[PDB]
JSON list of C-alpha atoms in Angstrom, two decimals:
[
{"chain": "A", "resi": 1, "resn": "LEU", "atom": "CA", "xyz": [-0.19, 0.35, -0.06]},
{"chain": "A", "resi": 2, "resn": "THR", "atom": "CA", "xyz": [2.67, 2.11, -1.10]},
{"chain": "A", "resi": 3, "resn": "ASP", "atom": "CA", "xyz": [1.74, 6.56, -2.11]},
{"chain": "A", "resi": 4, "resn": "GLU", "atom": "CA", "xyz": [1.91, 6.24, -5.58]},
{"chain": "A", "resi": 5, "resn": "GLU", "atom": "CA", "xyz": [-0.40, 3.00, -5.18]},
{"chain": "A", "resi": 6, "resn": "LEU", "atom": "CA", "xyz": [-3.40, 4.87, -3.35]},
{"chain": "A", "resi": 7, "resn": "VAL", "atom": "CA", "xyz": [-3.25, 5.95, -6.85]},
{"chain": "A", "resi": 8, "resn": "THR", "atom": "CA", "xyz": [-3.30, 3.26, -8.95]},
{"chain": "A", "resi": 9, "resn": "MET", "atom": "CA", "xyz": [-5.55, 1.67, -6.89]},
{"chain": "A", "resi": 10, "resn": "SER", "atom": "CA", "xyz": [-9.26, 3.45, -7.94]},
{"chain": "A", "resi": 11, "resn": "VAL", "atom": "CA", "xyz": [-10.61, 4.39, -4.89]},
{"chain": "A", "resi": 12, "resn": "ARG", "atom": "CA", "xyz": [-13.20, 1.19, -4.89]},
{"chain": "A", "resi": 13, "resn": "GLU", "atom": "CA", "xyz": [-10.28, -0.80, -5.27]},
{"chain": "A", "resi": 14, "resn": "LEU", "atom": "CA", "xyz": [-8.72, 1.17, -2.25]},
{"chain": "A", "resi": 15, "resn": "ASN", "atom": "CA", "xyz": [-11.64, 1.00, 0.18]},
{"chain": "A", "resi": 16, "resn": "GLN", "atom": "CA", "xyz": [-10.96, -2.71, -0.32]},
{"chain": "A", "resi": 17, "resn": "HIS", "atom": "CA", "xyz": [-8.36, -2.59, 1.80]},
{"chain": "A", "resi": 18, "resn": "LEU", "atom": "CA", "xyz": [-9.20, -0.36, 4.35]},
{"chain": "A", "resi": 19, "resn": "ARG", "atom": "CA", "xyz": [-11.86, -3.01, 5.09]},
{"chain": "A", "resi": 20, "resn": "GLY", "atom": "CA", "xyz": [-10.50, -3.72, 9.04]},
{"chain": "A", "resi": 21, "resn": "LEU", "atom": "CA", "xyz": [-9.00, 0.19, 9.24]},
{"chain": "A", "resi": 22, "resn": "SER", "atom": "CA", "xyz": [-11.29, 2.06, 11.87]},
{"chain": "A", "resi": 23, "resn": "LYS", "atom": "CA", "xyz": [-13.00, 4.80, 10.79]},
{"chain": "A", "resi": 24, "resn": "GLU", "atom": "CA", "xyz": [-10.09, 7.34, 12.71]},
{"chain": "A", "resi": 25, "resn": "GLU", "atom": "CA", "xyz": [-7.39, 5.44, 10.17]},
{"chain": "A", "resi": 26, "resn": "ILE", "atom": "CA", "xyz": [-9.63, 5.14, 7.16]},
{"chain": "A", "resi": 27, "resn": "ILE", "atom": "CA", "xyz": [-9.88, 9.27, 6.97]},
{"chain": "A", "resi": 28, "resn": "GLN", "atom": "CA", "xyz": [-5.75, 9.34, 7.19]},
{"chain": "A", "resi": 29, "resn": "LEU", "atom": "CA", "xyz": [-6.11, 7.48, 3.87]},
{"chain": "A", "resi": 30, "resn": "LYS", "atom": "CA", "xyz": [-8.85, 9.35, 2.38]},
{"chain": "A", "resi": 31, "resn": "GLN", "atom": "CA", "xyz": [-7.07, 12.21, 2.16]},
{"chain": "A", "resi": 32, "resn": "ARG", "atom": "CA", "xyz": [-3.14, 12.04, 0.25]},
{"chain": "A", "resi": 33, "resn": "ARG", "atom": "CA", "xyz": [-4.75, 9.22, -2.46]},
{"chain": "A", "resi": 34, "resn": "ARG", "atom": "CA", "xyz": [-6.92, 12.77, -3.08]},
{"chain": "A", "resi": 35, "resn": "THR", "atom": "CA", "xyz": [-3.70, 14.08, -2.98]},
{"chain": "A", "resi": 36, "resn": "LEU", "atom": "CA", "xyz": [-1.74, 11.95, -5.20]},
{"chain": "A", "resi": 37, "resn": "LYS", "atom": "CA", "xyz": [-4.51, 12.23, -8.12]},
{"chain": "A", "resi": 38, "resn": "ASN", "atom": "CA", "xyz": [-3.87, 15.97, -8.32]},
{"chain": "A", "resi": 39, "resn": "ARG", "atom": "CA", "xyz": [0.13, 16.21, -7.64]},
{"chain": "A", "resi": 40, "resn": "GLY", "atom": "CA", "xyz": [2.60, 15.43, -10.22]},
{"chain": "A", "resi": 41, "resn": "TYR", "atom": "CA", "xyz": [1.36, 11.96, -9.90]}
]
């Protein structure tokens, strides 16, 4: 689950892994993934 991965892994594919992460650990990941899609990556 690297950074460049959060992107390659469509949200749907991401929400797939999150399955098991508390509601707080889910928000921490729902952020960067949104940043990469915008950054140079």
